[PDB]
What does this fold into?
Amino acid sequence: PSFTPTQLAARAAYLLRGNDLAAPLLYPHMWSWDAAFVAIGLAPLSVERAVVELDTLLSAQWRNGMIPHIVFANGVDGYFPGPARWATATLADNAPRNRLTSGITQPPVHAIAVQRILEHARTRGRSTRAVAEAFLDRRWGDLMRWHRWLAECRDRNERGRITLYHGWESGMDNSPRWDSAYANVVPGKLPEYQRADNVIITDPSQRPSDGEYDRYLWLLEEMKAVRYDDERLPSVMSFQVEDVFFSAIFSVACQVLAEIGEDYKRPHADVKDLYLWAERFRAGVVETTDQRTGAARDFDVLAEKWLVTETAAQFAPLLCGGLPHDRERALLKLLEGPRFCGHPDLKYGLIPSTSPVSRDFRPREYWRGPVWPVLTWLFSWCFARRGWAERARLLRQEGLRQASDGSFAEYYEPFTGEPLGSMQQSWTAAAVLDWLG
Amino acid sequence: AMPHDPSFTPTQLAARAAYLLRGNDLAAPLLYPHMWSWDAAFVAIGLAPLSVERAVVELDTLLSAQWRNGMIPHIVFANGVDGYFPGPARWATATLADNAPRNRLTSGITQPPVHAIAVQRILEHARTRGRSTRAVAEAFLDRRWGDLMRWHRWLAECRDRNERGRITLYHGWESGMDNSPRWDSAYANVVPGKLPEYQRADNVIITDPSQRPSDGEYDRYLWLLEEMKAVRYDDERLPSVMSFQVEDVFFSAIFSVACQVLAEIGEDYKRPHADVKDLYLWAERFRAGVVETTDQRTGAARDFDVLAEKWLVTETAAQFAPLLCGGLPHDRERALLKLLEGPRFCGHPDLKYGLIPSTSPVSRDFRPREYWRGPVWPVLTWLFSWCFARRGWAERARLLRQEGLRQASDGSFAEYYEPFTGEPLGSMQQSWTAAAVLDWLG
Amino acid sequence: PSFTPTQLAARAAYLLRGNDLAAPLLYPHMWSWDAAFVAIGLAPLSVERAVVELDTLLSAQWRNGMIPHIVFANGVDGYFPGPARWATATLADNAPRNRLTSGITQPPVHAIAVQRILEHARTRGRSTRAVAEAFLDRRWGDLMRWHRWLAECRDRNERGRITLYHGWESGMDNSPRWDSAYANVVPGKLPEYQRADNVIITDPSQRPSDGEYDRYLWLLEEMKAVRYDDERLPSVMSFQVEDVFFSAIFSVACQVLAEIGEDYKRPHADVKDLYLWAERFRAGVVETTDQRTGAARDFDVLAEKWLVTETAAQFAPLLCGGLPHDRERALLKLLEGPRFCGHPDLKYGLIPSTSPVSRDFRPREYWRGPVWPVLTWLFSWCFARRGWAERARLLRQEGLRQASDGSFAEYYEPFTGEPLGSMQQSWTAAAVLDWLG
Amino acid sequence: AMPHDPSFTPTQLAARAAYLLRGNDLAAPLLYPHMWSWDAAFVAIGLAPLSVERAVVELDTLLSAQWRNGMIPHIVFANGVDGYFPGPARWATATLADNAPRNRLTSGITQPPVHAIAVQRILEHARTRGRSTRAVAEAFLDRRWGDLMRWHRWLAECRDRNERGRITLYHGWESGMDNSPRWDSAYANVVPGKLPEYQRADNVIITDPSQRPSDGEYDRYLWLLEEMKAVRYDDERLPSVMSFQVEDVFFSAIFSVACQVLAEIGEDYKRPHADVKDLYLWAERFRAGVVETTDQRTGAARDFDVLAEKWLVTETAAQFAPLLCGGLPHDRERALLKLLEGPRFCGHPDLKYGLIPSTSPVSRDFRPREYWRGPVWPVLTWLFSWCFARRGWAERARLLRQEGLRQASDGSFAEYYEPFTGEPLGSMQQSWTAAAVLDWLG
It folds into this structure.
């Protein structure tokens, strides 16, 4: 029990303020994903600072609503791919006037962070209440424009699933999920840049698991060749796969944002649209599932085949609901049984990223096996929102038990508990702070 | 109706404290890269609950600026180029003080010895944390024990040259409590001459507002510096030239507590028997020295102006010095506890909380918005609650801690508060209140 | 803050063990309602003792499935109405062989207590786990037979609402809800008994609010005249009203017991029936509601009129779900607005039993105004089960704040906080223990 | 892997403790309506967190059975008709003891004076609870102060007739720790004669198993009773006739702690100055009396057989008596703490938890399943942690409490546990462990 709940919350917040304190090289840029989770970690201790994190992200939102996956603080510190590689400032009609951003997106966890800010703000008085109210007044339209872009421009055919054009957009790129989609990307001659002819991809979780690095950059070249135009990307992109996990998060996020719109008297037509997308994508997720187990499947749009992999993404339906009782029960059995949380070799009953009995299991490599506390955080938060109060409590209790040595790595070896790596911000610290406070 | 839930639960409050620990940017003060002896000790106290290694790094950094004779100076300057005043140029310790450290810019005065308390919090937390962290705490003590002994030895030998068991201060700044009724009459006898012409403006503001003289008699404060410089900060010569020499009874009691604490550390970690004996000897010298000052009926302690040869009588929290270190006979301690808990201090009916006011609200010197002339400082309550616990006053300790946590639960993390309205009044460079809260909770 | 959470849990459990310690005269008999809540209060500290409380109740279950509202420990201590007045031993074909019981029922909170026992049992090992498993193996059939009796014999016309034949069956008799139904009960000459010609009703919450005591006993005489025969009661009873609160609890209880059957591999046909009743009664509750506010209405079956009263029973739909978003939002506004929890004169934001602005409001008289912590407990537990995690948390936080003086009365004056009375067992202690532990 | 969550959280555990407080019916023991002096004190300690009035009623009931000379007897019988043995018939105090209370059946021996500790827990909790409950606690003290003084005065005057500062026991039962190596050699010198023929079976079992002689030498135990009866329990005559007279150094230290605690209560509630002075005087008499027994190198305390005129040397937790009351010179206290924390006691590597074993596992007398010959009693750890806190040993106190709570978290609430396996071994009439847990948490 190396840290008590107060000591652990103190250590988590210290490891979110980032000052003084192997660790990773920290860059000044801002990540869509990290921003949402820092906001969730911040809301317990500072609503103002949580609001500033989202305000800063959202001021880099594209004019069509897309939130890009990175916002660069500059173009000289050698981050790759950087502003020079993406070139959205000159190429994309919708890149913002005064911000440098990438040209891909990231899962819509943002409405979850907004809900955390508003919930914590309501218990804190008048001044802080008005800070959260002011944020909502200033950013509701932008959150709506983000959800509307995903629904209209990444579900052009109203199938209720979000289409990804890069594994990087999933949040879960070093994963078995995409291996077969990526295997059909065959790159040509990459153009000549001023960067080296072999520049290392800076974020190591974004490196391809087999150094097939041209594949990843070739997708960028296809995006740039149509200037990131959402109307033209389906004609030229070599990677087009409907991500069923992203889709379920989107459904949850639409339901959360609708409930926010009703609690805070937002325009009724927006609430209706939000409710409608939430049910559209709930059905889209369910449409992918196995008839026996309920497991969700990603869909390779180009290959026209259900991708079949044994990762945590299978459990997408448990986040957003929609399964019939029998198949939801089936799927919970899978989640809690020996292929996942009940695998007898696991040190803790957190969710492994890939099933230890899968052929693709790699106990040390990112989402191919290792345990990520932020994944268990997300399930526990979604379970509580679905009414699975005691399932949510047991996950939270298990996440805290694992986190209480105060290591705060972002992923751990699923059998030995060894901490395996840290991200730019500590998603695990944010998960622990939300769990405790 | 039963009290409403505070803005912050204990885990939320501990998180907010850890987030703010090295400065409340959440009206905020101007932050400098320099390191303060007092702030460093309390940041180390706040850090030990959440990271022993980071706490150790804070004291390692301070102690590497120790003077060759053992004095820990009140500031270590990160640079002499950002305009903090008085800075390296005004102090000129690097050229004038033989004992100033070779590769470190510092001031030439000292600060209360709360460091042994910080070391005790580091070692106490480290013991519970597994052998790797236990090792970083033992490595620290092996490397810094000599240094902590030499600090205490300097205070006992050079600021109590006549073995009276009280620490002599050459400036109100050395007390940690400068803006206070305690020193007004001693300052009123400092009469500056023609101050030398420096390269700064002749009007140059003292950067730290808690250090500005309450009356703007700023020449007085800077004149004491010139006296120190005139004798090159030589401990043998300062008593001949300083216009300010007062025995600080609060500093003296903290020193007594510190020697006792360090001595217990020295035994638990097989430090040299001769150091421990010395430490225990000083702890008793200064305990009795504190008691020697006390009022015969209330037990209240008194500072002593060495030059005026006069017991200074003021009604500030410094009167309760004997409660920290012990030593009072039983009936005067009860008397003094009655004074502390009664209507002149914690039981004053206008106080929002029962934390200790820095000056008694019924005193003529009471100013409810000015630093130590009345306002409530959580770090003072923390210091009392920690000392009460070590004296075996378990319930008194518990109730101070409870009351400090009640007051901190709005998350304001100011260093001092209006004692009647609870309005937060100012922040220091590091948040001592955040450190107090982290220790109380962690 | 007169008691800390540990001190308050200790005091609550002391005031549930009943020994040593104005207060009420405690009788050796066992109440259906009190038994369920004592079990909920006991599960945190002793699963075994919780199981013994329900086992003891259920061994007095009638052969048709009805759980009676009282189980008498004897017929000599002068409780009235006692075994001699009810006479179910000689009259009712289904009264149990070796137990003395009343001839009326009580809301089905029992499945909620069973869920608390199983949840707490799972975290406590092997021996205690087997104790809860053994209970379920022994009592699942009986819980099914209780739910089946309510659905088949108190909803004979499959309207999805439970019919009551006595205000005493509602759990909420001293209430504005029934005043107009009771006003149409006109009694004849009551038969001669050996008891006095004026025996005080022992439980004071069961006394009629206007000493029209003959009305209450006359209903008993109608039940006895057809020997409590469920097939004949609708022909002879002068009080027949569909209780929409009881109905919503029943729906929640069916959903809870179905989820129990799935977690603990109970027979699948039972789970199907449970799910079916849960949705039948959810719809029945919704069918009563106001088109503007969503407020639920009780139905007087004989008068054929919707009873319109401004009590907490209006909020029945919030317990079991089923309203459309707009009307659920409307109804939450009513609950949280100035007619109820946000009435500015209330000392705490617990739910008043009747709206302070209603004409029927009586700030000192049982369910006509006063604040009952067990009512707020039930809403908060149902809210958490519906996913309203932060609404559940704020109610629980408010209930604890009110309870932390350690007074443990069952109801309080809604404006001054004055404790107004104690029941046989402390439902409030059970609520506090569940909230804390 | 990081430790798994215990069967009970602190609120659940506090609830379970309060539910069990007056007897673990959840293998359970046979419960009698009688009241035990020792159990009554600890039930009052367990009750104060949850009900001051109920705690006050528990001591009021005990104290109404006090003898006219101040002795609190170890049992108050609710009746003499349920067959508890030895009962009113065997003790015959109602006819033989001039000082036995008029309308209350009691035994004729005493028990350690832990009552002042219970009073301190009642008053401490009452102070925080509002004026109505503050009033019921002041009313109790007004009514029972004389009585508590007369109890302490009886112990100081009649069980330390020669002002040696140690309490003389006339039976192992009076120690609260009868089934223990501490008394084996003193018992081995009791040689019974023809025991008188009573109306019970000649074989009649001692009802309380912790009171049965370990060796079934039951004649010895009952023979001491006959000696007491032969002199009508007269304090002046018992030293002439008793075959068992040993100074109990643990009882003596608890008495010293008790006098100190009661004296602090007497000042805080304006009790008579002469009572407080007496209390402080006895507290120091018995502190020094305890220290007088101690080993010269370890500081371990020793019981003294008055008749054999011999220091009893046994390796039980009673050696640590000086840690409770203070008084040891600094270096022998460190020695004795090294013994307590080291491999013969808390640091024994085979122990499941670091609670204090009743007998050292390396002793030849160590029996791991037999009462005080080895097993772990949470109430002993509670008593040490409470005394450590009053001595200012804040961290040692905290770590005992933490360790006791760790061990109690399975909810077993036994009074003593196998020290190697943690297996619960037996319950008393009231759950002292439940009271310890409620105090630690409440």
Notes: Chain D touches chain C at residues 5, 7-12, 14-19, 21-22, 26, 49-51, 54, 57, 128-130, 411, 438, 441-442 (CB under 8 Å). Chain D has one domain: 1-442. DSSP finds 17 helices and nine strands in chain D.
